[PDB]
Each structure stands twice: as C-alpha cells, then as structure tokens.
Antibody
C-alpha cells in the first residue's frame, strides 16, 4: 500500500519560508520516481511545483517560482520535502505530494514526470501575517422536526483553516455533516458540525464531537447534552 | 506558454461533451497530454495518460485525443456523477516544466430542483455566559446552488451581525450553506423570537427560535 502524507505548518508569514514534508510508506524513497509537489489555491487551479527523482537526487522546478523552491529527500526517514522562500498570498494553497506510476507507451518507455497516480491528502498552507487563534467549541443542542434530532458543535473564532470534526472518535459517521466555515468580519473563521440521530438515542447514547485545529496544536472533545 | 481551457462546460444526461485544451508547439505540439478529474474536496485523479490511454477504473465513456497544438477530452453517456473539474497537463520543452490548463468545470444539465433543509440553533448557555449569542442556520441539500438568507427579530428584518457563506457543492451534487447571526447576550434576550428565512427558487423556508 503506497501512501503519501503531507505535514508542516499551516500558517506562514509573508516573506518567510514555507517548509513541508511528505512521509512515504509502502515504498522506498529511493525508487525511480519523480517525487512531486503540486499546489492548488483555494477555489483555483492546479500548479506543478517540481520533483526530486528518487534514484538520482535530480530536481526540476516550475520557473514560475523563480528560484524560490528547493525539493530535498531523506532516505533515513523515507520522506521528501519542500521549501519555498519569500512567500506571498499567491503561495496560499493546498499542497499535495504525489508519485507517478509506470505505464509503458507505444515505444516501450515510461514517461513518469507528468503522471500523478498516487496523491497525498493535501495540506493547506495559508500565507498570512495574522496570528494563530485556537477555537472555542460550543454545543449545538436540540419534512420533520423531532423524530430525528440534529445536535452539533459550533467551532467558533479560529485562524487559520482548517478544522476537522469527527464524532465519537470516528465510530459515528452516518448522518454527520460538517459545514464549510464562515469567515466573519473579525477575520476569524467559525464552522458547525452536526449529526442527525434518532431522538430516542438522546438518552441511551452519549455524543462527543472531536475537534482538531492543528495550526494551534489544539484538540477539544466536547460532550453535547440535551 | 500556457495551457488554455474554457472555464466551464455542460452537457445533457446521456449525451456527450468535449473539453478542449489549447497549447503551443513546445508542450502539446511535441509531448503527451494528460487529463485529471477532480471531484469536490478530493485530490485529482489520473483520467487519461499518453493523450488517449485510460488507467484502470476509468470507463471507456472517457476518451482523449490530440491534434497539432490542442487536445480534447470527450465524455459520452453523461451522468450527474461526472460533474467535476477536468484539467489537462503536459510537459513543456521550453520551460522544462509540467503545465496545467486552468481547468474546466463540467455541469450536467437537467438535474431536478431540491428544496433546502434548514436547521436553526439558538445560542448555547455556555456562549451566553460569555455574554455572546451566535444563532446558527444550517442549509443543506438544495439545488440549484443559490439561496438568499434573511434574518428576523420579532418579524422585523435584521441588518447587523449577519454573515452567510457561499454555497458549496456537496458530494451528492446538491449544495450546502450556513448563515450566522452574531449577537450579544443582551440582544438575544431583548426580542421574543428570531427567525432564519431561506429563499430558494422563489419559495421560502423559515425556522424560528425564542429565548426560553
């Protein structure tokens, strides 16, 4: 099972250096692959950043990045990494690491560089001069009105994105809806996550929302009671 | 040197659509073209490689071609599940870079209207202890993706403190949005009721809460 996983700070101040790593499992980083970084500004298109070739160390970068980019690799950790210096708002994006696959063409060759067959989940990096702010979590307590009940958690006044919410440590997945965040005039985000449950279960079942705001290294498990 | 795609495309269910990608001799004119499909909130997936080949799991409804300095993705037997952003990609010999087209958002026509489901929450007693009161109005499963949200205090239109998200496409091809009325605790208790009114395709759904 070849798997890639990005990690790194979600907030970077303008003119400083964005630094990200991609942990690779299910395969050696020394494989003959163009270990690649691709980014996507929220609501916009894909942009290729570059690669490091696992079996040589050779690199190639998008000239749009103008000598700001370094891609490295670490065999002892089985990872490769990205450094992007002198960032601006144009560098705010979800950053993906990706690996090609081998498909033989009509002449017997593999052209791997533009093939992105295995992708990481992506990590949002916001370039902003504003400070990190952890969320306050409040319970949202309760065609239909009361055969099922919507209960939730309001994740209030955080920065930057993202926040993830699960319910009962991931044991509760049916009927869960985590909404896209609102950006309030304060410059802080809020979101709401709601699970719709049988109203009978409000007594016999405890409901906990597991909020994670990685940019502030903060987790909150909030019990939602009626 | 860029790859140019029309930003939008559409087709009817069961019919076909073609998505174009325009480049130059240094990228499409001399290299393979690749296509990627991206559903909402997910990473792109390889759809076409070497200009006309499909990886495992891609139906033959999807086909690719290239001629001169342009390439085309054709999709037949269109289904609502095909709504996605489609990107072309190619190596450029001049820039020594992978180029992406700007992406084409595909709409499948004829999808039926869906009225929003609306859920309204009063402030929690925990927030009220901090002298604040946020009312939360959650709006889901509506189609097409455009709503108007109005707030009422004792049936009078509220102006201050309203913030409403843009609609976002759900995994089921319908849309979701949310609206927030940020009050102080004093303002919340000062009226008998508050309402969130959601207008969609000329009809409205309104929920009311009252300080108990």
């Amino acid at each position: 099972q070849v798997q890639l996983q990005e990690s790194g700070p979600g907030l970077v101040k303008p003119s400083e250096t964005l630094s990200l790593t991609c942990a690779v499992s299910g395969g050696s980083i020394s494989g003959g692959y163009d270990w690649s970084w691709i980014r996507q500004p929220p609501g916009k298109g894909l942009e290729w950043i570059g690669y490091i070739y696992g079996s040589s160390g050779s690199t190639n970068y998008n000239p749009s990045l103008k000598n700001r980019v370094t891609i490295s690799k670490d065999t002892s950790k089985n990872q490769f990494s990205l450094k992007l210096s002198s960032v601006t708002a144009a560098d705010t994006a979800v950053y993906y690491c990706a690996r090609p696959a081998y498909y033989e063409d009509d002449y017997g060759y593999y052209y791997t560089t533009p093939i992105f067959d295995y992708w990481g989940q992506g990590v949002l990096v916001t370039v902003s001069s504003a400070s990190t702010k952890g969320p306050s979590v409040f319970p949202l307590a309760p065609s239909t009105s009361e055969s099922t009940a919507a209960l939730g958690c309001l994740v209030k006044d955080y920065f930057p994105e993202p926040v993830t919410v699960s319910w009962n440590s991931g044991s509760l997945t049916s009927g869960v809806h985590t909404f896209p965040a609102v950006l309030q005039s304060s410059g802080l985000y809020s979101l709401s996550s709601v699970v719709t449950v049988p109203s009978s279960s409000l007594g016999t079942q405890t409901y906990v929302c597991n909020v994670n705001h990685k940019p502030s290294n903060t987790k909150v498990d909030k019990r939602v009671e009626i | 040197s860029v790859l140019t795609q029309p930003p939008s495309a559409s087709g009817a269910p069961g019919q076909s659509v073609t998505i174009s990608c325009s480049g130059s001799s240094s990228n499409i004119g001399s290299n393979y073209v690749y296509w990627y499909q991206q559903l909402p909130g997910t990473a792109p997936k390889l759809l076409i490689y070497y200009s006309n080949q499909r990886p495992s799991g891609v139906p033959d409804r999807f086909s690719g071609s290239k001629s001169g300095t342009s390439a085309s993705l054709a999709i037949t037997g269109l289904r609502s599940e095909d709504e996605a952003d489609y990107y072309c990609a190619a190596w450029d010999n001049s820039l020594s870079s992978v180029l992406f087209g700007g992406g084409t958002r595909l709409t499948v026509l004829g999808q039926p209207k869906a009225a929003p489901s609306v859920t309204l929450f009063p402030p929690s007693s925990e927030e009220l202890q901090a002298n604040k009161a946020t009312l939360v109005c959650l709006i889901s499963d509506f189609y097409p993706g455009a709503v108007e949200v109005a707030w009422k205090a004792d049936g009078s239109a509220v102006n201050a403190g309203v913030e409403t998200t843009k609609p976002s496409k759900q995994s089921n091809n319908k849309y979701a949005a949310s609206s927030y009325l940020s009050l102080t605790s004093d303002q919340w208790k000062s009226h008998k009721s508050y309402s969130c009114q959601v207008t969609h395709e000329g009809s409205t759904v309104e929920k009311t809460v009252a300080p108990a």
